[PDB]
Design a protein that fits this description.
Two copies of one chain form a homodimer.
Chain A (H helix, E strand, L loop, with lengths): L4 E3 L2 E3 L3 E3 L8 H9 L5 E2 L16 E4 L2 E4 L8 H11 L7 E5 L4 H18 L2 E5 L15 H15 L3 E5 L5 H12 L4 E6 L3 E5 L1 E2 L4 E2 L7 E5 L4 H14 L4 E5 L5 H10 L1 E6 L1 H6 L3 H16 L16
Parallel strand pairs in A: 3-16, 4-7, 7-8, 8-9, 9-10, 10-15, 15-16
Antiparallel strand pairs in A: 1-2, 5-6, 6-14, 11-14, 12-13
The complex binds flavin mononucleotide (2 copies) and the ligand COC(=O)c1cccc(CCc2c(C(=O)O)[nH]c(=O)[nH]c2=O)c1 (2 copies).
PDB class: oxidoreductase/oxidoreductase inhibitor
Keywords: Rossmann Fold, Oxidoreductase, Dihydroorotate/orotate and fumarate/succinate binding, Cytosol, OXIDOREDUCTASE-OXIDOREDUCTASE INHIBITOR complex
Assembly: dimeric
C-alpha cells in the first residue's frame, strides 16, 4: 500500500509538499526539500528583482501556530527560473514555481519567460494573489475586478495550465463570487486554499509587546489557529470548481489533519508552519500517519474518500 | 488595586461580561448572568418576532474553541424590552441589549421603541452588524454602503449613544474604511471587536462528518482559534477611533487573555465560548487571574495599561 497519485500530467509519490515561503528560498532549501520524502516542492513566491524583505524579527511560532510579516524576501525570478531550468532534478519529484509580482505587468513579464521552461521541463506555475498593503486599495483576491484582470492577463501571456494561491474567504457570497471568477479561466487547473489568515496580532503578556517588528506587530497567521478556516475554503472551492483540483494548505501538523483536508476535497496537501517548526522529517511522519488512518478505515486509495466529507441530514 | 471602571455614564465592578448569544436567551439565563460576578451582561441579539433558529446540532465545542450556526433563535424583541424595562435589577450591574434585525427597517422599529426605556432605565444598545442582509450579499459590516445606511438610520431613529458589534476584518483596507465609516457617527460610542470568524468548517475524523447540521457544516468560529484575530481587530480600531471605546471579544479563557485584550485597547472584555463551556463561575476565576497579573506587574488600575501594547522600535 502506498500514497502515489497522478495529476496535472505528473506523477507524485504522495500528496505532501511544502507550503510556498517555507524551506524554499535558497538553493540549499530547495535541495533539502528535494531530498525529503515530500511528494513535490514549491519555490518561494518571487518578484522580478531580489528583495531583502522586512526588518527582523518578522516570523514567530507558538504552540498554536505562527505569525509572519516576511515582506516577500526572495532571490529574484532569475534565480528560481535558473533553478527550474538547470538545477532541479525532475526524476526526484515535481516542482512548482510560485510568482508574486507587485503589478499585473510584472507578473506578465515573469510568466512569458517561464512558459518555455514549463513546456520543456514541466515546472508548474502557482500564481500568488496576495501582496504587501497599498493604502487605499484591498488585496487583489479581495477585489474581484482586479482578480479577473490579473487572471485574464496571465492566462493570455502564459498560455499553459497553472494554479492560483488564494487568501481565505469568510463570507458565502465571496465564495460564490471568487469561484465564478476562477471558473471563467480554463487554464486555472488548480486552486490552493489557503494563504495565511491576514493581519492577526500576537502579544506577549510578560513583555507587553507585540512579537514581530514590521507593521506594528500585525502579520499573517498559520498553524492550528487556521485549520477550520482552511477546511471551509478547500471544501467551498471543491464544491464550486468541479473542473479544477483544490490543494489544501493550513493547519496540517499530523496525518489526521491531512486526512481532513483530503475529505474536504484536497488533491495535494501543503505544510507550512509545522514544516518550519519540525523540519523536513515531518514528511515521513505525515505519510505514516495518513497510511495508518487509511488502513484502520479500510481505504486503499485517496480517491476513495477525497471530497467525501459527510453532511448531516 | 482594583478592576473598577466607569464608562458610558455607568459604573462597572470589573470589565467582564458575557458575549452576546451566550447565556443570555431566557429570563432564567439573564438572572443567572445577573447573579454572577460579571461586571455587566448583554442580552441575546433579538429580532422583532420570536425565532426558533436553525435545526440541531447547531453548536459544538472542542479543545481549541467552537463552531456555531444558531440562526438567531431568540424570544423576540418585546421580551428583551420587557426584561430591560421591568425585570432587570440595575442596582446589581449594567445591562446591554443587543439587537440584530434582518433589514434596516426592522432595526429602526426596534430602536424607536428602545429609546424611551434607554433614557429612563439606562439600558445600553449594541447593534449587531455582523449579521445577514439580503441573501447573496455579504453580511452588513462587509458591505460599507449597507453599513453606512444602517448607521445613519439607526442614529436618526434612536438619538442616544449606542455601540456596534463588528465581524473580524483581515485586510488593512477594510480596517481603514470600516473605521472611517464608524467615525462619521458621533452617537456610536463603543465598538465591539469581534463577532465569530465567519464560515469555518470543523470535520470529525472518526465519523468523516461535519459536526453541525445547518449550512453543510459551515459556521462561525469562536474561542482559542480566534484570539490573535480578535486582538488585531481591537488594536486596529483602538488606534483608528480615538474618540470611541473598544470592547474586546474573542478567545478569552484566562485573566492573561483578558490582559492581552486590555493592552490591545479593550475597555470591556466579553467571554463567549469559554463561558458556554465553563459556566458563569468563570468570572470569579478571570477576575482573580487578572488581579494576580496586575499585582505581579505593579499595576493598580486598568487605565495604567489599557492600549499600552509596545511595538518593536
Ligand atoms: C515564513 C512564511 C513565509 C511564507 N511565504 C509565503 C510565500 O512566499 N508565498 C505564499 O504563497 N505563501 C506564503 N506563506 C503562506 C504559506 O504558504 C501558507 O499558506 C500559510 O502559512 C498557511 O499554512 P500553515 O498553516 O501550514 O502555516 C508563508 C508562510 C510563512 C509562515
Ligand atoms: C452559541 C453562540 C451564539 C452567539 N450568538 C451571538 C449573537 O446572538 N449576537 C452576537 O453579536 N454574537 C453572537 N455570538 C458571537 C459571540 O458573541 C462572540 O462574538 C464570538 O463567539 C467570539 O468570542 P469567543 O471566542 O469568546 O467565543 C455567538 C457565539 C456563540 C458561540
Ligand atoms: C495581505 O498580504 C500581505 O500583507 C503580504 C505582505 C508581504 C508579502 C505577501 C506575499 C508573500 C507572503 C508572505 C510574506 O512574504 O510576508 N507571508 C505569507 O504568509 N503569505 C504570503 O503570500 C503578502
Ligand atoms: C437568519 O439569521 C442568521 O441565520 C444569522 C447568521 C449568522 C449570524 C447571525 C447573527 C447572530 C449570530 C449567531 C447566530 O445566532 O447564529 N452566531 C454568531 O456566532 N454570531 C452572531 O452574530 C444570524
Amino acid at each position: 500500500m502506498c500514497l502515489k497519485l497522478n495529476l496535472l500530467d505528473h506523477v507524485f509519490a504522495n500528496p505532501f509538499m511544502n507550503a510556498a515561503g517555507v524551506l524554499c528560498s535558497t538553493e540549499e532549501d530547495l535541495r533539502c526539500m528535494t531530498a525529503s520524502s515530500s511528494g513535490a516542492l514549491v519555490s518561494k513566491s518571487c518578484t522580478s528583482a531580489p528583495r531583502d524583505g522586512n526588518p527582523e524579527p518578522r516570523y514567530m511560532a507558538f504552540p498554536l501556530g505562527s505569525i509572519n510579516s516576511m515582506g516577500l524576501p526572495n532571490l529574484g525570478f532569475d534565480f528560481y527560473l535558473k533553478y527550474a531550468s538547470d538545477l532541479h532534478d525532475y526524476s526526484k519529484k515535481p516542482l512548482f514555481l510560485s510568482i508574486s509580482g507587485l503589478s499585473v505587468e510584472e507578473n506578465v513579464a515573469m510568466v512569458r519567460r517561464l512558459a518555455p521552461v514549463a513546456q520543456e521541463k514541466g515546472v508548474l506555475l502557482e500564481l500568488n494573489l496576495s501582496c504587501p498593503n497599498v493604502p487605499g486599495k484591498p488585496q487583489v483576491a479581495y477585489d474581484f475586478e482586479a482578480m479577473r484582470t490579473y487572471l485574464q492577463q496571465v492566462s493570455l501571456a502564459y498560455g499553459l495550465p497553472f494554479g492560483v494561491k488564494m487568501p481565505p474567504y469568510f463570507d458565502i457570497a465571496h465564495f460564490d463570487t471568487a469561484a465564478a471568477v476562477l471558473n471563467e479561466f480554463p487554464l486555472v487547473k488548480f486552486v490552493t486554499c489557503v494563504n495565511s489568515v491576514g493581519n492577526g496580532l500576537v502579544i506577549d503578556a510578560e513583555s507587553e509587546s507585540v512579537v514581530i517588528k514590521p507593521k506594528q506587530g500585525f502579520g499573517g497567521l498559520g498553524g492550528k489557529y487556521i485549520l477550520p478556516t482552511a477546511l471551509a475554503n478547500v471544501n467551498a472551492f471543491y464544491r464550486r470548481c468541479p473542473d479544477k483540483l483544490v490543494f489544501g494548505c493550513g493547519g496540517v501538523y499530523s496525518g489526521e489533519d491531512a486526512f481532513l483536508h483530503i475529505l474536504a476535497g484536497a488533491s495535494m496537501v501543503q505544510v507550512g508552519t509545522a514544516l518550519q517548526e519540525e523540519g523536513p522529517g515531518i514528511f515521513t511522519r505525515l505519510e505514516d500517519e495518513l497510511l495508518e488512518i487509511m488502513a484502520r478505515k479500510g481505504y486503499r486509495t485517496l480517491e476513495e474518500f477525497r471530497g467525501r466529507v459527510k453532511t448531516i441530514e
